[PDB]
Amino acid sequence: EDAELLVTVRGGRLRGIRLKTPGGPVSAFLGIPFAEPPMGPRRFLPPEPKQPWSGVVDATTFQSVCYQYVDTLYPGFEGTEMWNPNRELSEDCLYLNVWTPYPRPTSPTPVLVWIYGGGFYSGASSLDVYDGRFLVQAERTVLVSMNYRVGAFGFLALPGSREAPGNVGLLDQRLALQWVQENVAAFGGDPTSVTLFGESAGAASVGMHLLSPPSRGLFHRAVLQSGAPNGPWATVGMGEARRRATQLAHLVGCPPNDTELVACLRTRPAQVLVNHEWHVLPQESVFRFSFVPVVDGDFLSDTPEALINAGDFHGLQVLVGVVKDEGSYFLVYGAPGFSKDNESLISRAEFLAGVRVGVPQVSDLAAEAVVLHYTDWLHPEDPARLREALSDVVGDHNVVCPVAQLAGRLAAQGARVYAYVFEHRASTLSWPLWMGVPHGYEIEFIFGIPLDPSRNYTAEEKIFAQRLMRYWANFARTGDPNEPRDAPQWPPYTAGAQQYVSLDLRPLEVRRGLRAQACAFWNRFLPKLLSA
Amino acid sequence: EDAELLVTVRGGRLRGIRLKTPGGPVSAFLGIPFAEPPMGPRRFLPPEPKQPWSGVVDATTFQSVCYQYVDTLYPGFEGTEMWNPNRELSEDCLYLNVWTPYPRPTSPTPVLVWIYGGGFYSGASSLDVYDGRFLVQAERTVLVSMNYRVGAFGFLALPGSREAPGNVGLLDQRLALQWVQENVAAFGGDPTSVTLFGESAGAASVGMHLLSPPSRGLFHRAVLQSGAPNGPWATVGMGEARRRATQLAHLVGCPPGGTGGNDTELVACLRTRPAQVLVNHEWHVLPQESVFRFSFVPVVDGDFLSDTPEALINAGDFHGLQVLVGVVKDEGSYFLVYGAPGFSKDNESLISRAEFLAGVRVGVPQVSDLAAEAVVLHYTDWLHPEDPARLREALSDVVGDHNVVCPVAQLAGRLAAQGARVYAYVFEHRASTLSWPLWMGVPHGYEIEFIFGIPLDPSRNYTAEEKIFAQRLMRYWANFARTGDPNEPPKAPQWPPYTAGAQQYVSLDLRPLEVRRGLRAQACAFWNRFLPKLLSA
Ligand SMILES: *[C@@H]1O[C@H](CO[C@@H]2O[C@@H](C)[C@@H](O)[C@@H](O)[C@@H]2O)[C@@H](O[C@@H]2O[C@H](CO)[C@@H](O)[C@H](O)[C@H]2NC(C)=O)[C@H](O)[C@H]1NC(C)=O
Ligand SMILES: *[C@@H]1O[C@H](CO[C@@H]2O[C@@H](C)[C@@H](O)[C@@H](O)[C@@H]2O)[C@@H](O[C@@H]2O[C@H](CO)[C@@H](O)[C@H](O)[C@H]2NC(C)=O)[C@H](O)[C@H]1NC(C)=O
Ligand SMILES: Cc1cccc2c3c(ccc12)C1=C(C(=O)C3=O)[C@@H](C)CO1
Ligand SMILES: Cc1cccc2c3c(ccc12)C1=C(C(=O)C3=O)[C@@H](C)CO1
Ligand SMILES: *[C@@H]1O[C@H](CO)[C@@H](O)[C@H](O)[C@H]1NC(C)=O
Asked: Which residues hold galanthamine (chain B)?
C-alpha cells in the first residue's frame, strides 16, 4: 500500500492513483464526491454538501459526466468528438478531481481550479484535453477540476420559485470552491492562493464568481480564456428564462403553478429533457444556448455589465485572451452555406441571412448596422471575404468584444490585467484550414497535452506548450505571467494603450487594440441603438 | 464699327468688346439683359423675359452682383475676398455673359454654360476666377455665364403662394438657358451641344436642371464639381421653408404686430423693406448654429422638383446622358473656420476631443443624439481617440463627406447604374498661390481657377507646371463638352468611366492620371445606405 495515495478529507478517507508523465509521476484523486447526488427530488435544487462516509472512497477513476446533449453534427469526427462525453452520463455527477505532485507537496502549493466550458449545456472534467497531469508535473501546482450540472439540470429557472430557482450549476461550482477551501491543504494545496481558470462558458463562470460576493472570497486570481460573463449568450433575463422553462415543460407533456410544473419535470427521464432543450430557443441561431445563468438579483445582483461598471477591482489580477479565429467553429452549426467539408465560400445572400443567425433576436435596424460595419464596400460580394467577415461577426459579438470590454473596465477600475491572442494552429488540428485557430484550440497547449509522447505534436509545439504552462503558472503564483527579463515582457492591458501579446511559436509580440474599431461598434454604439 | 463685335439676338442689337488673352483675341459680350429687373413689385417673383429694345445695348462690362451677404470673417484676406462681390450690389442683376472666339466661329461650336456656387446665398458671374476668356481662347468653345438671384431674393419661399413661390433663382438660370437655346447660334454656338457646368451650389443647380423636365430639354451634358442636388444643404422641405420665410418676415417687422397670416400681405410687406435689411437678418432664421447650411435654398414643392432629388435620381432613366463629376481633396476644411469650435485659418486648429464632439453637432446639424453617436463612432480612431491632428482631419472628413463627397458618390453611382456614362475625379493639386493655411489641404472651390485657365494670366504668379496642368484640365473639360468623353481622340493614360461596381475615378494633379477605386466607399456606405435608415427609426 502506498501512503502518498491515501488522504483524509473532511467527509472521510480517499484512495488515489499514481499517474505517469514523461517528466515523472503525479498523484491523482479522481471522482471525489463533493455534493449529494442532485437527482429525484433534488433535480433543479441547489447542491447539498456530501455527507461524511465510512470506509475509503475509491478515487482512482473519473466519475460520470453530468447528463447532457451529445453532439451529432459529424459522428466520429475528432474535432467534435473530443468535446463529447467520454464517461457514462448520469445526474449523479457532482464529483471533483485533484492532481498534485508526487510525492505530495509538504509545503502549501498554489492551486489552479479549472472550470470547463461547453455553452453551459455540455462539458466534463474527464475530457482528455483537460488532463491535469502535465501542468502539475511541470509547474508544481495543485490542480482541481469539478463537474457541474449543465443544460436544464443546471440552469432551468422559474425565477422566484423555490423548486427551480436557477443558477444551480453555478452553485455546484461554488460548492466545489468551498470544498477546495476546506480540503485542499490535505493534498498540499494552499487555500489562500487559488487561481480560477476556465474557457468559454467556463470563463463566463469565472467572471460570474468574480462578480458574486459569496464566491469572491473563495479564490484570489482569475483567468478568462475566450469568454466573459458579459457575453450576450452567457446570461438570460428572468422573463425569458421563465418562458424557456415553461416551453420545455410543454414540449415534454407537462403539466399532466411553478410547484406543479417542476414536480412534473422531475418525473421525466433526464434524456427526455435533453431531447427538447434546443427547441425552446426563440429562433434558429448559432452561439445561443437555452439554459444559462439567469440575472435574478440573487447570484448576480445585476447584469454582469452593470456589476463590472460599478466594481472597484483594486487587488485583482486577471489574465484574459482569445484565439485568432473565435467565430469560425460556430458557423458550421447553422450559418447558411457553411461546412467543415468544403471551403464555405458563401454568397452575399448567404452572408446576409447568416448575419441574422449569428446576431439573433435584434431589430432589422441593428442587423443593417452589422452589415454596414462588416461589409467591404469595395468588394461587397467576394465569397472569401464574406466567409471571414461572418466569422468576425460571430466571434466579435460573442467573444472578442465582451472580453475586451471586461478587460478595459477591470483595468480602469483598478485590476491588473494581462491580455493575449492565441495564434498557433495545432499541427494536429482536424478542422479545415479555413477555420484558422478555432474556439477551444488553445486549451490543449495550456494543459501541456503536446508533451504526451503518444500524441503527434512537433518538438516546437512541446516547447511552446512549456512556455504557456509557465506563463499560466507564473500568473497563478504571482499575479504576473512574466519570466525574468531577457523577453520581451508581457505588459499589462490598460483601457488607453490596450496592449496585448500574440502567443505563437515565435517570441511574444506586443500589439495594441483588441479589434478596437469593431469592438467600439459592439460595446459603445450598438447598445445605444438597441435602447432607442 | 467692328462687325465682329455686333450681334443681333431676339431682343435687339448688342455691341461687345474684343478682349486680349495671353494666347490671342476673344470676343466678349458682358452684361446682356435676359430678364426684366426683378425689383420693386417683381421681387420674389419668377423672372419675366426681357422686353425687346430698339437701338444697340452695350454689352461691354459685367453688370451688378445680385444683392447678397458679404463675407466678413477675415476682412481683406485674399482667400475670402476672392468670393466676395466685385461689382456693385443691386436687385437689378439678371444679366448674362457670352465669350466667343475672334473671329466668330464659322460653323456651330459647342457651348459651355457656367453656373457659379456660393451656397445659394452668394456668388456672381463677374468673379475673376470665372473669367471665361482663357477657356474660349484655348479650346475654341463658346462660354456663357449668368447671374441668378440668391439668398432671400432668389429662394425665399411661401409654398403655395403666387407672390413668393420659391425657386425663382433656379428659374433665373432656366430663363438664361432658354436664352442660350434661342440666341447662342448668333454668336457661333451650337444650341444642340450645350454642356452645363457648376461648382458647389452651382453643381447642385446643374443636377436640379437634370431632374426638372422643363430644364432637361435645354442642354445635353453636365458637369458637377463638388456639389450635388441631393446634398443635405441643397434643398429644404415646404414646411421648413415656410418657417424660415415667416421668421425672416417677423425679424423685419412683417406683418406689423404679428407672425405669418395672409401670404399676399406678408410678401407685400417684405417687398417694402430695403434689400440690405433682408440681408442683415437672413442667417438668423436657421434652426441652429451650423456650418454648410444656408437659409434660403431650393424648395421641394412638387413644381420645379416633383420629389426630392434623392427620389428623382433613384427613379430616373439616364440613358443618353454623359456626366462628369468630382471633388477636391479636402472638401470639408474651408467650412470649419465658419463655426466649428477651435478652428481658425490663423492657427493649426489642433482641436480637443471635446471640441471634436461639439463640432460634430455643428457639422451634422439637426440630427438625433443617436445619429450623432453613429458619426462619432465611424469617425473616431479608437486606438487614438484624443489625438488633435487626427481629430482635426476627422471633423474635416465628417463635414466634407456628409455635404459633398457622399452626395456626389451617390449621384454618380445611381446615374451610372441607370444608364448614364459617368466620369469621376478627385482634384489633388494645392495651388502655389493658395492663401489658406497648409492644414486645410486642397479646399472647396480651389479647382475652379485651373479649370478656367486662370494660371495663364501673366499678372498672376502661377508656376509653369501649373499652366501646363491648367491646359490639361481645360482640355479634358472641353473634350467632354465636345464628345461626352474627356479622353483625347493615344499613348496617354486613359480616364475610365465610373460605374457602381468598380467605382473608378482619376486623380487630377501635376503627375499624370492615376486610376483609383471607390469615392470614400466605406464612409459613403455609412452616409448613403445606413444613416438614412437610422434617421427613419
Ligand atoms: C458547402 O457545403 C454546404 C453544406 O453542405 C453539406 O456538405 C457538403 C460537403 C455536401 O455533402 C452537401 O451535399 C451537404 O448538404 C453547402 O450548403 C448546402 O447546400 C445544399 C444544396 O447544395 C442545401 O440543400 C443545404 O441546405 C445547404 N446547407 C447549408 C448549411 O447551407 C454548400 O453549398 C457547399 N458549398 C459549395 C458546394 O460551394
Ligand atoms: C486657434 O484659434 C481659435 C480661434 O481664435 C481666434 O484666432 C486666434 C488665432 C486668435 O486670434 C484668437 O484670439 C481668436 O479668438 C481659438 O479658439 C478661441 O478661443 C478664444 C479664447 O481663447 C475664445 O474666446 C473663442 O471663442 C475661440 N474660438 C473658437 C472656439 O472658434 C483656439 O483656441 C486657437 N487654438 C490654439 C490657440 O491652440
Ligand atoms: C441541435 C441544435 C439546434 C440549434 C443550435 C445548435 C448549436 C450546437 C449544437 C446543436 C444545436 C453547437 C454550437 C452552436 O452554436 C449551436 O447553435 C457550438 C457551441 C457547438 O455545438
Ligand atoms: C453670419 C453666419 C452665421 C452662421 C453660419 C455662416 C456661414 C458662412 C458665412 C456667415 C455665417 C459661410 C460658410 C458656412 O458654412 C457658414 O455656416 C461657407 C459656405 C463660407 O461662408
Ligand atoms: C390678402 O389681402 C389682400 C389685401 O387686399 C387681398 O387682396 C387678398 O385677396 C387677401 N388674400 C387672402 C387669401 O385673404
From this structure: 83, 199-200, 334
